[PDB]
Amino acid sequence: PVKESSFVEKMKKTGRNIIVFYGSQTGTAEEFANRLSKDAHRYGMRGMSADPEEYDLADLSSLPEIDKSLVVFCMATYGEGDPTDNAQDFYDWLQETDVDLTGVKFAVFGLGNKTYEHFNAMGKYVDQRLEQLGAQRIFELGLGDDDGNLEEDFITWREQFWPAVCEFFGVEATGEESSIRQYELVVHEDMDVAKVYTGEMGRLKSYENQKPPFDAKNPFLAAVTANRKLNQGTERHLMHLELDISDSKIRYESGDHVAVYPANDSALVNQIGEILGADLDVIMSLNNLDEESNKKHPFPCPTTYRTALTYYLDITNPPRTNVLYELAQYASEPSEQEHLHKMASSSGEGKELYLSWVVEARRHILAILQDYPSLRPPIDHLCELLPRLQARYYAIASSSKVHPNSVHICAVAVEYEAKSGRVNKGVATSWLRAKEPAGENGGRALVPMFVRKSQFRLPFKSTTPVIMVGPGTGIAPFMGFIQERAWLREQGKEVGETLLYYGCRRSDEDYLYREELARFHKDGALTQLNVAFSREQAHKVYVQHLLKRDREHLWKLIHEGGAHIYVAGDARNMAKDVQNTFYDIVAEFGPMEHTQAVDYVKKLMTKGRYSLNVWS
Ligand SMILES: Cc1cc2nc3c(=O)[nH]c(=O)nc-3n(C[C@H](O)[C@H](O)[C@H](O)COP(=O)(O)OP(=O)(O)OC[C@H]3O[C@@H](n4cnc5c(N)ncnc54)[C@H](O)[C@@H]3O)c2cc1C
Ligand SMILES: NC(=O)c1ccc[n+]([C@@H]2O[C@H](COP(=O)([O-])OP(=O)(O)OC[C@H]3O[C@@H](n4cnc5c(N)ncnc54)[C@H](OP(=O)(O)O)[C@@H]3O)[C@@H](O)[C@H]2O)c1
Ligand SMILES: Cc1cc2nc3c(=O)[nH]c(=O)nc-3n(C[C@H](O)[C@H](O)[C@H](O)COP(=O)(O)O)c2cc1C
């Protein structure tokens, strides 16, 4: 990327004394950064949030040139305790630099967690490194946990952070409070249709005029060739889709991920407009009131409210506390204005109400507008407050050795009864489920997508043994692994053992790729096809039980055969239980104490022989 000029100079030229950097992948850290940046005004200060990737952090050395200057880092962790893609350069710089940061004042809030090994790795590193470099910490490191409730961890940290800042710099709670807007509304009663965004992510008309290379800013509209129901029963809906990436020049390997940009439910969009009495077809733009910022709009503009609510805004996840806080002013019934205002509390009934009535109940914006009927905010402000609609990732279920021009997806459609009382539908899966191949040329079901390279890969040597554990939709990446493994064999190569440990409720309910797997097994592509049917008997039978059963042979492949272990699917419980079972296997056949088995297994991970492709 081409770097922006010195952030320190921008701050000087714009009267800013605090800058907040975000290492964000799915926007969580980015949003916290903006919240902190906006907070500054309430304390006699002025800040800006910034993407570290667009700057050279070596300029931190010049920050002391600004009086009462301070830098805050909101850093989330990804991969294997890595830094977010956008924080890679900063991370590389921190280890390599020897620059002296004497005079620099900092604070760090990490978006870390517990269902992962190095929980909050990045956050801890930045906070530690800046100090080593000579900078002085102005407030304790924050350790947020997305497994419980990050929002609340942030609220807690934030509540103590500002007072600490005011006391150190000797500033007053000046601003106190008062509704402030980041963007101004400009309605376009004309506008040449050719310059109105209709859902594209980057360059205007980029969805209609496709031009490579394609990525997150320029997605490729892949035609949906196939979309079929995978499960045999009716309990749920599991689907297999095939996206045509021919002529896109996109490359991929088994184990990578495919991201898609979905469209919200039209009915839901319609109702929001209706309940607010807003005309959704109004063409408009929301322009930053700060003419100096590079963030000219909250989303592609000009555009209609309908398009924004459909392709650019998140209207289904529970609104964050600051959003409800800003909306409170539009609730005409006192008790309702009060509940909304108190959602941002660090303790008490207001906090409990938020955790239960909003988060736990999974109340999206429309639900709140319906249940607190006096809340009728203007459409333009709400659009400024809502977070951006994020792309959804899927473990590519095919091998490029076999399907170089097609990317496959295996997904379960999300649809559940929320405690809010309504049925919530998953944005991307509901949208993907409705995509229909059409028929030859009559209608073209297109899916905006791009590929994100992962580190989940089959061994370089075809002879290395492979142990795959992926129950449920965790089978997704392994279909690619297996197609490729079978391919290698077909190509005359010597392939080591390939074992699949799969699981589903019942063979006649949701045994995904039943036919394909049976075929691969029959042809020898799969050395063993171990399937745990969890509900075909009174007790549970899970993949870990099969692993325990085969402990002796697996240990042989692991300790003597240099086998590679892969775990995909549920990251919350399955992955951990599977990990624990491997601990026990190693502990028995080592032999060695549990503590040592853990180390042994954690080493396999570091040496690239124990990989994960899990999610929640
Ligand atoms: C690297 C990676 C790979 C992935 N690979 C796959 C894959 O191969 N296949 C696949 O199916 N998915 C996969 N996912 C999950 C995928 O990205 C989507 O999250 C999933 O398909 C649902 O998206 P959605 O937009 O339909 O749902 P959304 O509208 O985004 O809603 C999902 C949210 O709803 C909530 N939720 C769901 N069920 C309930 C319930 N019963 N009660 C309360 N809350 C609930 C949760 O908070 C969840 O976060 C992957 C994720 C990552 C990060
Ligand atoms: N937030 C929520 O409330 C919520 C609720 C449901 C699902 N989800 C999400 O939706 C996804 C469901 O994916 P899926 O359809 O592919 O999986 P799935 O069908 O639910 O499960 C696959 C197989 O794994 C078994 N299993 C359950 N717990 C296990 C454990 N601890 N260890 C080993 N095996 C276990 C299941 O048996 P049994 O089911 O009989 O135990 C089943 O046979 C998950 O990634 C999850 O994050 C979220
Ligand atoms: C694919 C994936 C990998 C993750 N890996 C880690 C990890 O190694 N350590 C950790 O503490 N959290 C991990 N998390 C959780 C994030 O750190 C946490 O959800 C954070 O709030 C995300 O912030 P963001 O939206 O700003 O990127 C992971 C989340 C996803 C989706």
Tab-separated table of N, CA and C in Angstrom, residues 7-96:
chain	number	residue	atom	x	y	z
A	7	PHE	N	1.283	10.884	10.414
A	7	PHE	CA	0.062	11.099	11.180
A	7	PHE	C	0.296	12.185	12.225
A	8	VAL	N	1.539	12.339	12.663
A	8	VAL	CA	1.834	13.365	13.649
A	8	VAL	C	1.587	14.742	13.048
A	9	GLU	N	2.024	14.944	11.807
A	9	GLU	CA	1.816	16.233	11.159
A	9	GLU	C	0.326	16.488	10.932
A	10	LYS	N	-0.431	15.456	10.557
A	10	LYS	CA	-1.872	15.647	10.357
A	10	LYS	C	-2.501	16.126	11.660
A	11	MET	N	-2.113	15.483	12.759
A	11	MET	CA	-2.630	15.830	14.075
A	11	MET	C	-2.297	17.278	14.396
A	12	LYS	N	-1.064	17.685	14.109
A	12	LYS	CA	-0.657	19.062	14.362
A	12	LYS	C	-1.536	20.016	13.561
A	13	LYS	N	-1.617	19.776	12.255
A	13	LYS	CA	-2.406	20.622	11.371
A	13	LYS	C	-3.899	20.645	11.713
A	14	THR	N	-4.408	19.602	12.373
A	14	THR	CA	-5.836	19.539	12.698
A	14	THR	C	-6.192	19.680	14.180
A	15	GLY	N	-5.216	20.078	14.992
A	15	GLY	CA	-5.467	20.261	16.414
A	15	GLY	C	-5.800	19.005	17.203
A	16	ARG	N	-5.297	17.860	16.766
A	16	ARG	CA	-5.567	16.629	17.488
A	16	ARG	C	-4.405	16.290	18.420
A	17	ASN	N	-4.717	15.815	19.624
A	17	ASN	CA	-3.664	15.430	20.571
A	17	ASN	C	-3.687	13.922	20.811
A	18	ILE	N	-4.782	13.268	20.443
A	18	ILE	CA	-4.832	11.822	20.586
A	18	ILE	C	-5.204	11.082	19.302
A	19	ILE	N	-4.506	9.979	19.063
A	19	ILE	CA	-4.753	9.141	17.894
A	19	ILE	C	-4.944	7.704	18.347
A	20	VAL	N	-5.945	7.033	17.782
A	20	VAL	CA	-6.269	5.670	18.179
A	20	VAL	C	-6.181	4.762	16.970
A	21	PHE	N	-5.266	3.804	17.040
A	21	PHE	CA	-5.056	2.849	15.958
A	21	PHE	C	-5.842	1.559	16.186
A	22	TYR	N	-6.327	0.960	15.105
A	22	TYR	CA	-7.070	-0.287	15.218
A	22	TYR	C	-6.511	-1.410	14.359
A	23	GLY	N	-6.338	-2.568	14.989
A	23	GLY	CA	-5.875	-3.757	14.304
A	23	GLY	C	-7.163	-4.555	14.289
A	24	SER	N	-7.944	-4.392	13.229
A	24	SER	CA	-9.231	-5.062	13.128
A	24	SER	C	-9.397	-5.903	11.867
A	25	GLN	N	-10.108	-7.016	11.996
A	25	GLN	CA	-10.349	-7.871	10.853
A	25	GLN	C	-11.836	-7.831	10.535
A	26	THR	N	-12.673	-7.990	11.555
A	26	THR	CA	-14.108	-7.957	11.322
A	26	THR	C	-14.770	-6.697	11.873
A	27	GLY	N	-13.972	-5.641	12.022
A	27	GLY	CA	-14.482	-4.358	12.479
A	27	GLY	C	-14.712	-4.075	13.954
A	28	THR	N	-14.480	-5.057	14.814
A	28	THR	CA	-14.684	-4.882	16.248
A	28	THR	C	-13.711	-3.865	16.855
A	29	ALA	N	-12.421	-4.020	16.566
A	29	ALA	CA	-11.404	-3.103	17.083
A	29	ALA	C	-11.531	-1.741	16.425
A	30	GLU	N	-11.905	-1.736	15.150
A	30	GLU	CA	-12.049	-0.485	14.427
A	30	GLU	C	-13.125	0.381	15.060
A	31	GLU	N	-14.233	-0.248	15.440
A	31	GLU	CA	-15.340	0.480	16.038
A	31	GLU	C	-14.993	0.999	17.426
A	32	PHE	N	-14.226	0.218	18.182
A	32	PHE	CA	-13.830	0.652	19.515
A	32	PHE	C	-12.931	1.870	19.366
A	33	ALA	N	-12.080	1.852	18.345
A	33	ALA	CA	-11.164	2.963	18.115
A	33	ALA	C	-11.933	4.249	17.844
A	34	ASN	N	-12.950	4.171	16.991
A	34	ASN	CA	-13.746	5.352	16.668
A	34	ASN	C	-14.486	5.869	17.883
A	35	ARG	N	-14.955	4.949	18.721
A	35	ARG	CA	-15.665	5.338	19.927
A	35	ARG	C	-14.706	6.112	20.831
A	36	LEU	N	-13.493	5.598	20.998
A	36	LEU	CA	-12.511	6.284	21.838
A	36	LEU	C	-12.137	7.629	21.234
A	37	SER	N	-11.956	7.661	19.916
A	37	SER	CA	-11.590	8.900	19.240
A	37	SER	C	-12.668	9.950	19.447
A	38	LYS	N	-13.926	9.537	19.330
A	38	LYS	CA	-15.037	10.459	19.517
A	38	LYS	C	-15.152	10.911	20.971
A	39	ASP	N	-14.820	10.024	21.907
A	39	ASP	CA	-14.872	10.353	23.337
A	39	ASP	C	-14.009	11.564	23.687
A	40	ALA	N	-12.829	11.643	23.076
A	40	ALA	CA	-11.880	12.722	23.350
A	40	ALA	C	-12.516	14.103	23.474
A	41	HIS	N	-13.451	14.404	22.581
A	41	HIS	CA	-14.136	15.691	22.577
A	41	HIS	C	-14.809	15.995	23.915
A	42	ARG	N	-15.304	14.959	24.583
A	42	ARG	CA	-15.977	15.131	25.868
A	42	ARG	C	-15.007	15.444	27.007
A	43	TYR	N	-13.719	15.553	26.693
A	43	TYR	CA	-12.720	15.827	27.723
A	43	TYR	C	-11.735	16.945	27.386
A	44	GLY	N	-12.177	17.893	26.563
A	44	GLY	CA	-11.333	19.015	26.188
A	44	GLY	C	-10.268	18.671	25.169
A	45	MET	N	-10.307	17.444	24.658
A	45	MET	CA	-9.323	16.998	23.680
A	45	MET	C	-9.946	16.735	22.312
A	46	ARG	N	-9.130	16.264	21.377
A	46	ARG	CA	-9.618	15.954	20.044
A	46	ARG	C	-8.802	14.810	19.478
A	47	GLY	N	-9.484	13.798	18.957
A	47	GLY	CA	-8.765	12.666	18.413
A	47	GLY	C	-9.141	12.268	17.003
A	48	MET	N	-8.490	11.209	16.539
A	48	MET	CA	-8.740	10.650	15.228
A	48	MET	C	-8.434	9.172	15.379
A	49	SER	N	-9.137	8.341	14.621
A	49	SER	CA	-8.892	6.907	14.650
A	49	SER	C	-8.134	6.680	13.352
A	50	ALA	N	-7.271	5.675	13.313
A	50	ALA	CA	-6.503	5.438	12.103
A	50	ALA	C	-6.107	3.989	11.889
A	51	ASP	N	-5.998	3.614	10.616
A	51	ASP	CA	-5.588	2.269	10.244
A	51	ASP	C	-4.068	2.335	10.206
A	52	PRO	N	-3.392	1.573	11.076
A	52	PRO	CA	-1.926	1.565	11.128
A	52	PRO	C	-1.250	1.197	9.812
A	53	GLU	N	-1.953	0.436	8.983
A	53	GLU	CA	-1.398	0.012	7.709
A	53	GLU	C	-1.189	1.169	6.741
A	54	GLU	N	-1.960	2.242	6.905
A	54	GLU	CA	-1.829	3.401	6.025
A	54	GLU	C	-0.759	4.375	6.501
A	55	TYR	N	-0.078	4.043	7.597
A	55	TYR	CA	0.952	4.926	8.136
A	55	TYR	C	2.241	4.228	8.534
A	56	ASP	N	3.253	5.040	8.813
A	56	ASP	CA	4.548	4.546	9.250
A	56	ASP	C	4.579	4.862	10.735
A	57	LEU	N	4.461	3.828	11.560
A	57	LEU	CA	4.427	4.023	12.999
A	57	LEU	C	5.736	4.488	13.606
A	58	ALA	N	6.782	4.561	12.789
A	58	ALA	CA	8.066	5.034	13.274
A	58	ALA	C	7.880	6.495	13.668
A	59	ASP	N	6.863	7.140	13.105
A	59	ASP	CA	6.601	8.537	13.430
A	59	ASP	C	6.096	8.728	14.853
A	60	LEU	N	5.890	7.630	15.569
A	60	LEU	CA	5.454	7.721	16.957
A	60	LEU	C	6.485	8.545	17.706
A	61	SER	N	7.722	8.485	17.222
A	61	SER	CA	8.842	9.200	17.828
A	61	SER	C	8.625	10.708	17.825
A	62	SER	N	7.783	11.185	16.912
A	62	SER	CA	7.489	12.614	16.814
A	62	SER	C	6.246	13.033	17.597
A	63	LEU	N	5.494	12.055	18.085
A	63	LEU	CA	4.285	12.343	18.842
A	63	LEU	C	4.523	13.276	20.037
A	64	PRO	N	5.675	13.142	20.729
A	64	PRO	CA	5.979	13.998	21.885
A	64	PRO	C	6.029	15.487	21.550
A	65	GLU	N	6.052	15.805	20.261
A	65	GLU	CA	6.093	17.192	19.817
A	65	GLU	C	4.748	17.888	20.014
A	66	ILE	N	3.716	17.088	20.260
A	66	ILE	CA	2.372	17.601	20.498
A	66	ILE	C	2.114	17.535	22.009
A	67	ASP	N	1.730	18.661	22.608
A	67	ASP	CA	1.475	18.708	24.048
A	67	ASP	C	0.312	17.825	24.465
A	68	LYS	N	0.484	17.151	25.597
A	68	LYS	CA	-0.525	16.248	26.133
A	68	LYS	C	-0.946	15.224	25.097
A	69	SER	N	0.002	14.833	24.256
A	69	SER	CA	-0.265	13.861	23.209
A	69	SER	C	-0.356	12.459	23.789
A	70	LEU	N	-1.099	11.600	23.109
A	70	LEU	CA	-1.276	10.242	23.583
A	70	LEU	C	-1.721	9.348	22.447
A	71	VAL	N	-1.238	8.109	22.438
A	71	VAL	CA	-1.644	7.164	21.414
A	71	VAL	C	-2.283	5.945	22.069
A	72	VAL	N	-3.404	5.513	21.506
A	72	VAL	CA	-4.101	4.344	22.008
A	72	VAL	C	-4.165	3.320	20.881
A	73	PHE	N	-4.013	2.051	21.243
A	73	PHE	CA	-4.062	0.959	20.280
A	73	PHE	C	-5.168	-0.033	20.643
A	74	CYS	N	-6.127	-0.219	19.738
A	74	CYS	CA	-7.205	-1.188	19.944
A	74	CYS	C	-6.838	-2.329	18.999
A	75	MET	N	-6.240	-3.377	19.560
A	75	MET	CA	-5.747	-4.502	18.771
A	75	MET	C	-6.395	-5.862	18.992
A	76	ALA	N	-6.943	-6.411	17.912
A	76	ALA	CA	-7.566	-7.728	17.941
A	76	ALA	C	-6.551	-8.738	17.411
A	77	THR	N	-6.719	-9.992	17.807
A	77	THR	CA	-5.822	-11.057	17.389
A	77	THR	C	-6.511	-12.004	16.414
A	78	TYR	N	-5.735	-12.559	15.486
A	78	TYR	CA	-6.270	-13.469	14.484
A	78	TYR	C	-5.344	-14.668	14.293
A	79	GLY	N	-5.687	-15.525	13.337
A	79	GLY	CA	-4.880	-16.699	13.051
A	79	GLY	C	-4.379	-17.435	14.278
A	80	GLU	N	-3.060	-17.568	14.381
A	80	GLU	CA	-2.431	-18.265	15.503
A	80	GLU	C	-1.702	-17.254	16.381
A	81	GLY	N	-2.460	-16.344	16.987
A	81	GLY	CA	-1.844	-15.319	17.794
A	81	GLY	C	-1.131	-14.334	16.908
A	82	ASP	N	-1.487	-14.253	15.635
A	82	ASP	CA	-0.906	-13.293	14.695
A	82	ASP	C	-1.501	-11.917	14.953
A	83	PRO	N	-1.249	-10.969	14.104
A	83	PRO	CA	-1.753	-9.574	14.212
A	83	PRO	C	-2.745	-9.574	13.101
A	84	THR	N	-3.683	-8.643	13.067
A	84	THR	CA	-4.660	-8.616	12.001
A	84	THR	C	-3.915	-8.268	10.710
A	85	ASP	N	-4.458	-8.640	9.550
A	85	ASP	CA	-3.807	-8.328	8.270
A	85	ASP	C	-3.322	-6.875	8.211
A	86	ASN	N	-4.168	-5.948	8.652
A	86	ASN	CA	-3.827	-4.529	8.614
A	86	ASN	C	-2.792	-4.089	9.645
A	87	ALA	N	-2.462	-4.967	10.587
A	87	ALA	CA	-1.493	-4.652	11.637
A	87	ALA	C	-0.186	-5.418	11.461
A	88	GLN	N	-0.073	-6.118	10.337
A	88	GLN	CA	1.114	-6.908	10.033
A	88	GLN	C	2.382	-6.053	9.956
A	89	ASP	N	2.336	-4.980	9.170
A	89	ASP	CA	3.493	-4.098	9.021
A	89	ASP	C	3.932	-3.499	10.347
A	90	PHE	N	2.964	-3.040	11.133
A	90	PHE	CA	3.258	-2.448	12.433
A	90	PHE	C	3.941	-3.485	13.303
A	91	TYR	N	3.407	-4.700	13.274
A	91	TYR	CA	3.959	-5.794	14.052
A	91	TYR	C	5.393	-6.086	13.614
A	92	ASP	N	5.609	-6.182	12.306
A	92	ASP	CA	6.947	-6.450	11.795
A	92	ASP	C	7.889	-5.350	12.258
A	93	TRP	N	7.427	-4.108	12.181
A	93	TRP	CA	8.241	-2.966	12.582
A	93	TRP	C	8.629	-2.984	14.059
A	94	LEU	N	7.692	-3.367	14.919
A	94	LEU	CA	7.946	-3.394	16.355
A	94	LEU	C	9.089	-4.316	16.770
A	95	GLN	N	9.172	-5.482	16.138
A	95	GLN	CA	10.215	-6.445	16.477
A	95	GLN	C	11.565	-5.976	15.946
A	96	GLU	N	11.556	-5.425	14.737
A	96	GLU	CA	12.788	-4.963	14.109
A	96	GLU	C	13.352	-3.605	14.571
